[PDB]
C-alpha cells in the first residue's frame with residue numbers, strides 16, 4: 323500500500339522540476355524534454371530503493387513526522403530513484419542494451435540515441451535541485467548532498483572496474499573472487515543498500531560517524547548477498563516467478579556463478595573460453611553443483627547477516643535491517 | 653607566467669585524486685584508469701577558465717592569502733577545468749566529433765568508445781572530491797558545491813536546448829535570435845564566465861545575493877559576445893592566428909552568422925536549406941555584409957559592457973571584469 327503513496331508523489335516531483343518554465347519560458351522546450359526523460363526513465367521499476375528511504379525513515383522516528391517531514395522523506399526517496407535512473411540510462415548505452423523494465427531503452431528510441439547521455443546527466447542534476455527545493459533549510463542538507471555525491475562516485479568507480487573486467491571479449495583470468503566482491507560493493511551495494519538507509523538516518527538526525535559506519539557494515543554485506551542471489555537467479559530462476567530471463571553468460575559477465583566455476587574447474591573444464599560468449603556453461607555449472615553451493619552459501623550468508631545485525635544495529639532498531647533481510651531472503 | 657603555476661599544480665591534483673589506492677587497493681585498476689582520463693582530458697586546452705579563478709581571487713583579496721589559501725584557489729581553478737572536461741568528453745560523443753584540442757577525442761580511442769560516458773561522469777565526480785579534500789572546513793564550502801551543481805545543470809539545459817535546435821538535418825525556422833541567445837546563455841556563458849568569478853567571489857567571503865546577481869549581469873553579457881565572436885571567427889578568422897579552421901555551417905550549427913543571415917534574406921536567399929549541411933553559405937554571408945554587421949555589433953557590445961561594468965561592478969574592483977574584457981576584445 324505504501325509503495326503507492328510513494329508512486330503518487332511523482333507527478334508532484336515532476337511538477338516541481340518543470341516549474342522554471344513559469345520564470346524562464348525561453349528554456350520551455352528543454353524543460354518539456356526533461357519531463358519526458360523523467361517519465362520514461364524514473365517510472366516502471368519496483369522502487370525498492372526509494373521506498374526503503376520512507377520505510378526506514380518512518381521506522382527511525384515517532385511523533386516527529388508532520389506532513390512536511392514525510393514530504394521530504396518521499397522526495398529524498400525519489401532522489402534515490404533518480405540516481406538509479408541516471409545510472410541505468412547511461413549503463414544501457416554503454417552495454418548496448420535493447421530493453422529495460424520490459425521497455426525499449428530510452429536511448430534506442432528513434433530521435434534520442436546518444437543525446438541520452440545529456441538526458442542521463444539531467445537526471446543526476448535533478449537530485450540536487452530536489453534537495454535544494456525541499457531540504458536546504460534542514461540541518462542534514464549538506465550531509466545528504468555529500469551522501470548522494472559519494473554514492474555516485476562509488477558507483478562510477480564500480481562501473482569502471484566492471485568495464486575493465488568484462489570488456490564487451492572472453493578473459494577469465496580477471497574473473498576472481500576478490501574482483502567480483504569489489505565490483506558488487508562499489509557498483510551496486512553502496513547506492514542500493516547503504517545510500518537509502520543512510521539518508522533516512524541523516525533525516526532522523528542520526529549523523530554520527532560511528533553509527534553510519536555500523537549501518538554500512540551490515541548493509542554492504544546485504545548488498546553482496548543480493549547481487550550474488552541475483553546472479554544465481556539470472557540463470558537458475560524461474561522467469562515465470564522473476565519477470566525476466568537472464569543473459570549473463572552470453573554477455574561475458576563477471577557472475578558469481580562463473581567465479582565459482584573457475585575456482586572449481588580442472589583444466590579440461592577450465593577451457594571451456596570456448597563457450598563463454600554467444601549454447602550450454604549451464605550444463606557445466608550443474609556438473610559442479612553450483613545450485614547446492616549457492617544453497618549452502620545462502621544459509622551461511624543469512625547466519626552471518628543476523629550476527630551482523632546483532633552486533634552492529636544498536637542503537638538503531640533491528641527492524642530497519644530485518645525488514646530488508648526478509649525481502650532479500652525469499 | 654601565472655598560467656604555468658596553475659598548470660604545475662595538476663600533478664598534485666592528480667596525485668591527490670589517485671590516493672585511495674593507498675587505503676583501498678582492490679580499486680587500483682579503476683583508479684589508474686581515472687588517472688588516464690584526467691591526463692588525457694584535463695590537459696591540453698588554454699585553461700582560461702580555471703586561470704580566471706586565480707586571477708580573480710588574487711585581485712579580490714591583499715594580505716589574506718597564505719600558501720593554503722592560494723592552494724585552494726588553484727584547486728577550485730582546476731575544478732572548473734574538470735567541469736569543462738566533463739562537458740567536452742561527453743559533448744564529443746554526442747556530436748560524433750573526431751578531434752579535440754588537436755588530439756583524437758578520448759572516446760575515439762580504440763578500447764574506450766562508449767565507456768567514455770562513465771569516464772566523463774568520473775571527471776564530474778572529481779570536482780566534489782577536490783572541494784571536500786581542500787575546502788570542507790571553509791565557510792564557503794556549501795556555496796561552492798551548490799555553484800558547481802547549478803553550473804552543471806544550466807549547462808546541461810543549454811545542451812538540451814542546443815540538441816533540440818540543431819538536430820544532427822537542416823531546419824532554419826528554429827534558428828532564431830531569442831533561441832540563439834538562450835543557448836549561449838545556458839550552455840556557455842554561465843559556466844565559462846559567471847562560474848569562475850562567482851567561485852573566486854565566494855572564496856573571498858563575498859557571498860551576497862545582490863553582488864552575485866550584479867556580477868552575473870556583466871558576465872553573462874560578456875559570455876554572449878564571446879560566443880558570437882567565436883561564431884564569426886569560426887568562418888572569417890585566420891587559422892594561422894586562431895589555431896583551428898571552422899565547420900559550423902556543415903554541422904547545421906545555430907551560429908550567430910546563420911541567425912543574422914535568416915533575418916536578412918529575401919525568400920530567394922532564404923532557401924538556400926539547400927547549402928546548409930555538407931560548398932559556399934560563405935558567399936551569401938559576404939553578400940549580406942555580415943562582417944560589417946559583426947564589426948558594428950562588436951563596437952556596440954563593447955560600449956554596452958563598459959556601461960555594465962560602470963553600473964554593476966561596485967563594490968568589486970572594475971579590474972576583475974576589465975581584465976576579461978580586454979582578453980575578449982582582441
Ligand SMILES: O=C(Nc1cccc(C2=NCCN2)c1)c1ccc(-c2ccc(C(=O)Nc3cccc(C4=NCCN4)c3)cc2)cc1
Nearest residue numbers: 325368370373374377378551552641642643644645646649
Ligand atoms: O516493499 C517491499 N520491500 C520493502 C521495500 C522498501 C523497504 C523495505 C524495508 N523493510 C524495512 C526496512 N525497509 C522493504 C517489497 C515488495 C516486493 C518485493 C519484491 C520485489 C522484487 C523481488 C525480486 O524481484 N527480487 C529481486 C531479485 C533480484 C533482483 C531484484 C532487483 N530489484 C532491484 C534491482 N534488482 C529483485 C522480490 C520482492 C520487495 C520488496
Ligand SMILES: O=C(Nc1cccc(C2=NCCN2)c1)c1ccc(-c2ccc(C(=O)Nc3cccc(C4=NCCN4)c3)cc2)cc1
Nearest residue numbers: 655698700703704707708881882971972973974975976979
Ligand atoms: O591569461 C590570459 N587571460 C586571462 C586568463 C585568466 C584570467 C584573466 C583575467 N583578467 C582579470 C580577470 N581575469 C585573463 C590569456 C592569455 C591568452 C589568451 C588568449 C587565449 C585564447 C585566445 C583565443 O583563442 N580566443 C578565443 C577566441 C574564441 C574562443 C576561445 C576559446 N577559449 C576557450 C574556448 N574557446 C578563445 C585569445 C587570447 C587569453 C587569455
